[PDB]
Amino acid sequence: LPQILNDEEISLYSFYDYANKNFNIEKLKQKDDIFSYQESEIESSLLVHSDAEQTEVAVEIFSKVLHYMNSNPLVSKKDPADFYSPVKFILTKGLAIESLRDEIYCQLIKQSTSNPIQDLNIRVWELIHFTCSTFPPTRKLIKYFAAYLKTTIQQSDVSKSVKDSAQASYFILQRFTLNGARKQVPSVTELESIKENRPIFVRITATDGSLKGLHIDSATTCQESSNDLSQRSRMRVNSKENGFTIIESFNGIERDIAPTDKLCDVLSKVENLQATLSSKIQVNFKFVFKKKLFFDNITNVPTTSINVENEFYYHQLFNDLFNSNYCKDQDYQISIGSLKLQFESSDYTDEIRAWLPGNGRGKYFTTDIEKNRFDDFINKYKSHKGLSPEDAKKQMVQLLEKHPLANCSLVVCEHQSESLPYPKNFVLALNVNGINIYDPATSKMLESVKYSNQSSVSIILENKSTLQAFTGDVQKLVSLIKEYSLYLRNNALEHHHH
């Protein structure tokens, strides 16, 4: 909700004043009024650039503005990549080069000034809206541009389509001011939504496998979406308290999304990755809503909300304990999996036994279990005869909670030390007590490293030596160390009483 410009300031930011002062007037010869719509290509840039190459790129940008302005609107469905090709050229240049951003905006203000055709003016406003959704003008133009938007919205004799685009452009500029910069050029899907002044649809998978459909905009961060999912799911409304976040998943490989990262930036990365493929492998992308942080901040305990969060965590933990990077203990896996089968299908029958091969894989037992321990699984399952769904679930929850990896943030790591007393393949299990070094081959905790000793990721051990931990997701490890350290700092502040 922060205003870029107050209504009282509109009259103090006339574009004509900005243009008279900053336009490259000496290098712009031409018969046509340089300040307003023209059909022909500009001979030089509208603004002054120090690099002659950027002046050239600015002239090229104007041709693409014309190309988009003049394109058949109904080509957008036929070949969307071709329709958005001039848009992506413009947005790529502007996002990469900050000194070229004001030039882009001025070209769009110019082409929407005294435009004689409403259909062409509608296209320029689509372009303004795509630009606003990508990068803002610099501080030297942003208030003149915000005045131009407000004048268009409140005064200008323009179409409803232009007023809607101008309103949505002002809103997204405000949204970005609050949420910070983006890193990627919008995908075709995002551009399609922006063009029509509508939200972006994203599908989030919960830990229980269920799907939640969500509407976001270009500026939507992981934190905002995590708070929205939390609130909708009837959990504690603040993801900073409940510890959940949205992660990115590609072919089962999970990557952390930072709290200020834009979900639409993950979509552009996906769009590129799914195209660069050109049919060689599967391209299974998912957003997943999972518990990342484990704070012992359960006070007025809203038990209802807490129970919803724990139910999601039990699915996540059970699935992590069926993953060989974390757990290789078959007797433990048989114990939790047989109770889950008892909870879902009740007492053993020979029909359940015939159904289990293939079907139960990754659900009630692992690959190693169906392989070498099917009768041991069945024998354990038969021992649960007479347990109600409630009692089998109670027993499964106790077994999950008793595991050393329960209520820990899990990180798969490797080390190259020829002297350190840890297996080369280890797990960092981060919780409120420390950075725990865990051996998934033996199911044993090896060491609890203090957050206080902390300044690939270099971890300072008790003996003051350094463990250089290599991982596929450094951002996750770094953020976990920072979040638990901040939580411990906040608890020390609350404990101090003058």
Among 3, 7, 17, 180, interactor with ligand GLU by CB under 6 A:
17
Residue (26 or 418) nearer to ligand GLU, CB: 26
Number of Cβ within 10 Å of residue 356's Cβ equals 20
* Residue 15 binds to ligand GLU (criterion: CB under 6 A): no
Task: Report the residue number whose CB is nearest to ligand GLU.
Answer: 140
* Residue 48 binds to ligand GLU (criterion: CB under 6 A): no
Q: Which stretch binds ligand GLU (CB under 6 A): 17-25, 152-160, 168-176, 337-345?
A: 17-25
To the nearest whole angstrom, how small is the minimum distance from the Cβ of residue 55 to ligand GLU? 17
Residue (94 or 360) nearer to ligand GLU, CB: 94
Under 8 Å CB-to-CB from 181, ≥6 apart: which residues?
Answer: 135
- Spatial CA neighbour of 200 closest among 176, 216, 219: 216
To the nearest whole angstrom, how small is the minimum distance from the Cβ of residue 143 to ligand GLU? 8
Among 22, 161, 249, 491, interactor with ligand GLU by CB under 6 A:
22
| Backbone dihedral angles phi then psi of residue 307, each to the nearest 5 degrees | -60, -40
User: Token pair of 315, please?
Assistant: 């699915």
Residue recorded with tokens 């890193």: 183
CA geometry: angle 356, 357, 361, nearest 5 deg:
85
Residue (144 or 451) nearer to ligand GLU, CB: 144
Residue (83 or 148) nearer to ligand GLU, CB: 148
CA 265 to chain centre: 7
Alpha-carbon distance values, 443 to 333, 368, 466 (Å): 12, 16, 23
Q: Which stretch binds ligand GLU (CB under 6 A): 14-22, 109-117, 202-210, 309-317?
A: 14-22
| DSSP secondary structure letter of residue 365 | B
Q: Which stretch binds ligand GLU (CB under 6 A): 13-21, 213-221, 306-314, 386-394?
A: 13-21
Residue (113 or 221) nearer to ligand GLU, CB: 113
Asked if residues 157 and 237 have their Cβ atoms less than 8 Å apart, the reply is: no
To the nearest whole angstrom, how small is the minimum distance from the Cβ of residue 36 to ligand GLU? 17
User: Token pair of 488, please?
Assistant: 């411990």
Q: Which stretch binds ligand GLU (CB under 6 A): 18-26, 106-114, 257-265, 396-404?
A: 18-26
Tell me what percent of the chain is helix, strand and coil, each rounded to the nearest 5.
50, 15, 35
The residue count of the chain comes to 498
| DSSP secondary structure letter of residue 9 | G
- Spatial CA neighbour of 128 closest among 158, 53, 261: 158
To the nearest whole angstrom, how small is the minimum distance from the Cβ of residue 172 to ligand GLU? 22
| CA dist., res. 224 & res. 237, Å (int) | 11
To the nearest whole angstrom, how small is the minimum distance from the Cβ of residue 62 to ligand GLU? 20
Residue (48 or 153) nearer to ligand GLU, CB: 48
Among 32, 63, 75, 140, interactor with ligand GLU by CB under 6 A:
140
Residue (18 or 68) nearer to ligand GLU, CB: 18
* Residue 18 binds to ligand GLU (criterion: CB under 6 A): yes
Give the binding site for ligand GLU (CB under 6 A): 17-18, 21-22, 140
